[PDB]
Amino acid sequence: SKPLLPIANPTVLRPANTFAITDTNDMSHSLALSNDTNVPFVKALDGSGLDEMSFDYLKKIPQFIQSKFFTTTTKPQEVLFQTKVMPHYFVPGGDVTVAMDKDITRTIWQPSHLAYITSMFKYWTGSLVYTFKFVKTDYHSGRVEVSFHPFSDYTTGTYSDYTYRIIVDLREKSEFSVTIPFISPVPYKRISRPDWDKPYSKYAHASTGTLVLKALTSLKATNTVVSNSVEILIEVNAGDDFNVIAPIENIFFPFSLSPG
Amino acid sequence: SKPLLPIANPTVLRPANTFAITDTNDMSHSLALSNDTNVPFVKALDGSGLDEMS
Amino acid sequence: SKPLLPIANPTVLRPANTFAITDTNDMSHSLALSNDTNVPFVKALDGSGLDEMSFDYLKKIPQFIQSKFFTTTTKPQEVLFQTKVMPHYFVPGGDVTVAMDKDITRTIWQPSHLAYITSMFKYWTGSLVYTFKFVKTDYHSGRVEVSFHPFSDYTTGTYSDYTYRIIVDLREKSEFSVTIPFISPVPYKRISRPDWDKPYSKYAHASTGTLVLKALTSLKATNTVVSNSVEILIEVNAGDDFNVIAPIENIFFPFSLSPG
Amino acid sequence: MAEQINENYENKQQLVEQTEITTFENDLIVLEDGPQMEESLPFAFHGQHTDNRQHTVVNFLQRPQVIFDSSWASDVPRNKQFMDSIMIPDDIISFPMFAEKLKGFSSLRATAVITVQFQTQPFQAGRVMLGSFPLPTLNPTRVKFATNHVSRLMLLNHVQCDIAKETEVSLRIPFVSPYNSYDLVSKRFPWAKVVGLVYSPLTTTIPVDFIVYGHFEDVELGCPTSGMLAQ
Amino acid sequence: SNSGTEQQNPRGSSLLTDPESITKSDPYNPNISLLISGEVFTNFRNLIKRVNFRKATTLNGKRISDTFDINSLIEAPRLDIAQYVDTETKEAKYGFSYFWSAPTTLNIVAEMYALYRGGVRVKVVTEKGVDFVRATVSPQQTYGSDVAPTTHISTPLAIEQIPIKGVAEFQIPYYAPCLSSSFRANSETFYYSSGRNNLDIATSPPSINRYYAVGAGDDMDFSIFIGTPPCIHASQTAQFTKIKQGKVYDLRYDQYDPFREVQDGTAFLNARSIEDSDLL
Amino acid sequence: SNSGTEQQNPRGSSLLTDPESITKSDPYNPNISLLISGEVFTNFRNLIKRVNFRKATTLNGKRISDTFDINSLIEAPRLDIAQYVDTETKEAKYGFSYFWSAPTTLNIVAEMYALYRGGVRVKVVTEKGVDFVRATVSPQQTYGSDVAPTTHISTPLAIEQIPIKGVAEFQIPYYAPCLSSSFRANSETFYYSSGRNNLDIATSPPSINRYYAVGAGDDMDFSIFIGTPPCIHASQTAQFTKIKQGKVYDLRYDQYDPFREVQDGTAFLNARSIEDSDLL
């Protein structure tokens, strides 16, 4: 035959498909035996059907973020623990501390599990789950008050009776874990460099509010059989609606180590 | 398999789609997580269903 | 008519289709009378419907790899033959031995049938079939033990009673052929340069284990009518599940000869 | 098939008797004799030497085996070990009950179960963490950074114990490897390294004692082998 | 309830169910990521498809080849300690450095897992005047031979033409004996769990600078969660201490990305990669 | 059973059925090539489609043409013996060499078979400044004439434009009188079994270096298995003996592949192709 052909649609040509995009198509060459040679997805390699790669699995893993004490010298209404409500923290003592010279040592503060996982994004949302462990016996005793102040600080003139709180009687009880909801004027808050020693009024863009663990009582204990100190162990979990968007940031660069 | 292919229609290539036009298509790269990532239209942001842009 | 046209999808252009791929399409020009001019496939050119090009046909062809002897001086439990379980070997005396000068001669060890066919790939799997010929009469006699040690060597402290073995009574019988299965911790083992004189503990990446042909008995024979030596002739065949993957290697370069 | 017309040699397909593993294939004649009309004594007459049960080689692996039996005082603080590290399954299958049974097997694919006991009179406090780093010989770069600190171990697969609440604790570690099984003849590719840290120190002088048990479930034993390597 | 004697939120329980809300009501808000972001993020398996620049080859000559291991790209690059000496006052200042390297989107995810499975995608950017770029994989080790060939006759070849396609995109499959392979360094030598592969990028005419960007192929999958890697603060890139001959950036980095400015930090004097035994 | 008096595993029986397992049970494991490799290999008919570089034309001048036989490309190239003389001590060292040639994926398969049938695919890479490349086939022999024409008026022509497509891909059909043709050299002269064809690659402007890569066309088929060819170890490419003026590689090779490094081996002094009569 061999007849002519009508003109086609005007095209526009690129050097590469868009690096930025997750989907659509890729122009690479296949160095395999055939094109679109792919390895089938095999699940439960880790022994469980939980997709260990899923964000909704990783985010739900508890992690210790700070320790406090609760003693027989604690006054009532004394704050034991006070944090901005935010997913990203620093690891307490798990710093990377390398020697530079015979006597110069430097310390890199290391990221929370949530801090690392949200490190590449820009905004977050959803409820968080704060767990409190009390390493004690059935023969210590104490009331703590976990009150969630959604928009404000805990300062002078801050009555905790306005806020969803839980007054837990720690006689036999030993642990405590609440889901702190996402209450904010913004559908998303900012991921940031974590700062323990900041109020909420600063970092107002990265936190929803402040949560406070407050003593209602001194720690009751007979000194001849049990101790006077009891360590508060705080963990952070990331709820179920915890959603994270806008992947145009980096707060933490990872590196690998060299074998020694 | 790998057989030959017939010749295609003659094309004509541009540096850009026409700036002037409202519609049709745009050749840009998406800097989002995925291509054709778009925000849904939400109406009555101004408190009324009147399209304040119309 | 002649109206305008909408813009097309953004394309990306290459100098050539991917050399590496077996399938998909090729951009070449046809120097024939018409495009996609192809010669129809005609089978049984070789007189048989077996696709002489199929890997699953080529792999199933027996080939002699080493000779041993079995005499009236052989002690019981003496190893006659010991090999790593692997498809690729060297041809015994079929070396390429060319003269370089009036008195310089060099020898190229030549590849097994399986060695050559798997030479372009990287990993193999599947069962192998080792054949043992005993060039004797009905008036020789002997027991041999063919025991497959899947993960280990044959050394001191190696009892062959732990392993699938065959104690064959060679009075009238003369031949012997077993399918040695693929037992390994890896779904595939490595194709390599073959080495007879290596144990399994070295080449642990290329072999499944060691197979051993061991005498259970001296060779019984009256010296006035038959001989004292009987030659063991070993062949190697490559099973039916023998699968070979990852075509990114070359161990053997072929060449053609010049007419003399 | 190459066709073969044989009339001088019988296809002696009998005289071929496999006995579990070993196959005899014989010429001439096979003979077998003994006392004829064999009976057995009923079970009341003997059987004072056995239990009313049978033990395979899969149990003997499902049996708990004591690995550790020790203590730790109040001098060890958070993020420091209270028990020695355990390689799975090297520090388990090296005990004679298991090793005598795994011998003669190529490999092992099973989930391992590490159980730990804890002794407490009700006046003692503290918490303790038991985690497992997968495949420590394949990623040695990352082992000691994921196990020198609590809150990098507990996001791994871990199990905690409140000293004044839990008297037993058991972590289930499923088999996981780039491979199918665990090479027994060469002991290559252990699939976890159990480490034990202190989540919070003791509050009294009285140390705490602990027993570490280890067994396997979901057991798939490999091919029979001699299991000896050169050296 | 929210408190009690049993462990109120163990790991195995956190993966499945959340504790009661402080409100003793429904604490959950509906997902509206698609309504504000315009896109939804749920799995890191998709996010690793994003290609970012990973390494650069500068310190060789005008060569026609560049061979290097593939699994090393799934690792995050080594962090190095940089010794700086003041050309005037001769006292030492000390910082951190990525030697002609940087991590990728891929490397942020891969460092949380133990094994990998699937193909790696490599895209190259070259200097001007380069006409072609060719990619080939080879096994790095002819097993049982002290030396590996310098050519191959049945390996994959893939040619991209720069002046008509400026980025040379290649996809390197998964070729390893095992189900899922390993990508970090180890001292295992008996038999191997990694698929050890080379990748040779050629340029016609021969050139000096090769810029490599890496990303996840479609079939990319990681296996066992192990934990968060050792990290460095991103803000440490802009912090610097001034000395006589110039600036000393806490996190020093090279022109690994052919599109980033060259930071005005003076060259160091010695480099030492942080070993696992250096951690205190 | 596994043993007996009849031949337990002849050829004709090995092609169809395997002997009993040593386990006296099922010895077979299931095919999982698609599950690990991501692809399945079963037939060499598909593998020959892979194109690798085969020869190079350097030792002519700045010409506008390069004519050569097509069936010679299905052969593996001749292996040559190289005489090296030490510029100092004047003793001879001896190695092997591929004179501006190398085998292809295609050549590994074609050397196991006797006859071929189908079209050959030839792809060319040229030097800079070349604008066009043209391909034409011609019969090499005007039968019955002592000379062949220098032009033709009804032959195939195929033009590729380099600066917009850098690799000039051509496909040469199967034109021979017989069902399946022969591709190796013979002394047959009565009538012929090979389809003797030339192939003329032109360059505008005329150039010197022509790099050719060959592969199997879709209709490629080989006929009669004959056996494994004479081979050379691939590891012999990196082994060398040092002399005064440089290195002497056991397997010496040229820049046949315009993307491979030039190996640092000194030129030889004499070349001799291994004849079939040289084998001992």
Numbering used by the authors:
A (entry chain C), C (entry chain C): 1 to 260
B (entry chain C): 1 to 54
D (entry chain B): 1 to 231
E (entry chain A), F (entry chain A): 1 to 280
Text of the article:
Black queen cell virus (BQCV) is the etiological agent of a fatal disease of honeybee queen larvae and pupae. The virus belongs to the genus Triatovirus from the family Dicistroviridae, which is part of the order Picornavirales. Viruses from the family Dicistroviridae have nonenveloped icosahedral capsids that protect linear single-stranded positive-sense RNA genomes 8,500 to 10,200 nucleotides in length. The major capsid proteins VP1 to VP3 of dicistroviruses have a jelly roll β-sandwich fold common to capsid proteins of many other viruses and form the capsid shell with pseudo-T= 3 icosahedral symmetry.
The crystal structure of the BQCV virion was determined to a resolution of 3.4 Å. The virion has pseudo-T=3 icosahedral symmetry with 60 copies of each of the viral structural proteins VP1, VP2, and VP3. VP1 subunits form pentamers around the 5-fold axes, whereas VP2 and VP3 subunits constitute alternating heterohexamers around the icosahedral 3-fold axes. A complete model of the major capsid proteins of BQCV could be built except for seven C-terminal residues of VP3. The finger-like protrusions of BQCV reach 34 Å above the virion surface. Each of the protrusions is formed by the C terminus of VP1 and CD loops of VP1 and VP3. However, no density corresponding to VP4 could be identified in the virion structure. SDS gel electrophoresis and mass spectrometry analysis showed that VP4 subunits are present in both native and crystallized BQCV virions. The results show that BQCV virions are infectious even without the structured VP4 subunits, similar to what was shown for TrV. However, BQCV does not harbor such a hydrophobic pocket in the β-barrel of VP1.
